[model samples]
Target: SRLPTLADNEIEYEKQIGKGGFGLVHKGRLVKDKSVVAIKSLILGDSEGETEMIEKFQEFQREVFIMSNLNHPNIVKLYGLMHNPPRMVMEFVPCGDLYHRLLDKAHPIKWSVKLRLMLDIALGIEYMQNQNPPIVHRDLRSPNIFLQSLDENAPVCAKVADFGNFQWMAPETIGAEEESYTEKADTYSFAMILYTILTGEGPFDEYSYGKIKFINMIREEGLRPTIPEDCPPRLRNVIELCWSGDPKKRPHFSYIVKELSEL
Candidate 1:
């Protein structure tokens, strides 16, 4: 398939909308349509040397390859790619991310909207895991969950982005760093995402300790985040099952979709 190649001047970079482990997402104006798009400029390294830049490009090539093939309503869409400077033209999500929304107490999300967003995120993970080779999203968190408007007046929808924190990784994956891991790891992360949404706080927000240390506490022994006082019992059951220390105990994405489907 042909890639969306365009001249460097074709898209005018405006301002940064979000930042991730590997790069920055900027709002850009597509000269042809004068419409909005996000430009993900992959920063290879801090140095200006060609060596560092090339190494950066070489590493990102794998994600670019997989990202181009991913197509799902709940996942961020990739519109095109730029080779000269190394970037991807993406869907411009205007509603920001789940993390920011949680912090904005004034903007209380109604239960209906929260449920919709929850199901949307579940579907996104389902699609990723259903892929032919089943690509695993090692780091699934609130910041990676973006929001977009279907129309100017339409309610916001959720979309997952940012795969940079692969090092942030999954429990089983971290265990066998060489043996590699599977989508079951994503299932573990789904529980953390649930805690984030249900509590209206970041994952493990109860503590000020470093995340790696926190995650290891769960991995090493059998630590689990406390269920928020406000979280409903039925939903908490699903979240707890996903957080099961053993990967085999976690439910599949399809089951998660079924559980969150009607609620």
Candidate 2:
């Protein structure tokens, strides 16, 4: 049987769920059974050039393929593709992203829950790494990790989503390769994610684009997010190792998963 496609105005879309550079996400429900889902729509009338448009299309294709192939408890599922002007249909979770939930005063989560959430993210990354050719997540941040409760009374579970910057890491391009970036680059990003989850702040605050070049030029100016006094020393060490400037020094995603799982 053929799957149903999205119509122009058929599915009832509710409030906006999230927003990013690529597109905006909305909560949608199919008319048949009121099953909730996430609908991501490309921004209309973008003034990007043809080359950029092709690149975006290629990225979309890659992300769709990766998401469709992934089946994990810690990863968001891709329900199907909707081509009514280039839309993506994804399995929806009622709760919001880890970023928002952490900031919400009424629903302040505990430190243990945050650690477990990071572990879930590590597991998802490990799964991606296990894929043929190995998928490297270029962008791993708090906003990309969605959260939901398995049960009303249970702790929130984290699901890694958003594959906009995911790329295949090739073994042939292991060192100083133009096509493939180092795996430690991902570990660096993951360190930022860990910092955000633990400290509730991003490594980079709002800064002018022009000033960023100068900011990044300082070689000895390695900065980390402020750590909480109560944070465990072992966890702090892990974060430091992940954020090391030398990519080879950082641990693999599998090792990260094991470490966090033990915690």
Candidate 3:
């Protein structure tokens, strides 16, 4: 309710940096502070037949509200909002997303860095869950994670980015239509992401299945991806607990943060 508002004239976009399914991200500068930022805006009235525009507009607003309320070192910062032409001014992380970094053959991430990234991800989730009405990141995946720097020596390198995706979706999330999701959904996703961080491959990378079958296997048959044979014993256990088929079995972010910190 007390979110900061940015004047449209104070911000200037230099170039298009990225675009997601619902918004376009632009690299821009805050004229006042001369700081770089990414502005995310809904792409309205261009295509999609003009019918779902209203729904998209509402969702964009919802995201802006959520982002505005969240403040964490491990999470992307939402500095303010621009009116007239609605857009969210967010912190700019120069390094690419974690998904690409995980599989970056030319510049591979060190094992120490991977562990730290996983801890960062857990801390972000813990902060979100500690909010008044917990924010269930519903979509948590590696691609939604961004690196602040590739330097293995940096204190914090990973920050949560654009939040879900199916490969990391929990069984309950896959079965439910919408709206009844909980933090456990995110816990399940975190497990998938952890697996990827350790192995540099996606969950179920060895399997080939369509969406329908994948959904069936996850929800109906309680199937999960294989854990790497050589994964660290402690980390492998944490992954197993987080990815349990029953949502009740998943550990809380607080517990996860503690476990990861001790590792």
Best candidate (score: lDDT) = 3
Least accurate 10 contiguous residues by lDDT in model 1 = 148-157
Compose the digit string of candidate 1's lDDT tens values, residues 90-200.
Answer: 777778888788888887777777787878888888899888988777768887888874232344478988664322345666646644666888888878887777778
The lDDT of model 1 is: 0.75
TM per candidate comes to 0.84, 0.76, 0.93
Distance from true location, Cα of 177 in model 1, Å: 1.0
* Root-mean-square deviation of Cα positions for candidate 1 versus the true structure, in angstroms: 3.5
Backbone Cα, N, C clashes tallied per candidate: 0, 0, 1
State, as a TM-score between 0 and 1, how close model 1 is to the true structure. Answer: 0.84
The global C-alpha lDDT for each of the candidates, from Candidate 1 onward, is 0.75, 0.68, 0.84
TM-score of 3: 0.93
lDDT of 2 by residue, 1-263 (tens): 12346674557788897774457788888776578989877654376776776766777767777777787788887766677667778878777787777677676567678777788778887787788767766657677788866242354478888874111112223233545565566677787788777777655542233444533432235544556788777788788788765668888877787777666
Task: Output the worst ten-in-a-row residue range by lDDT, candidate 2.
Answer: 165-174
What does the lDDT come to for candidate 3?
0.84
Q: What lDDT does candidate 2 reach at residue 102? A: 66
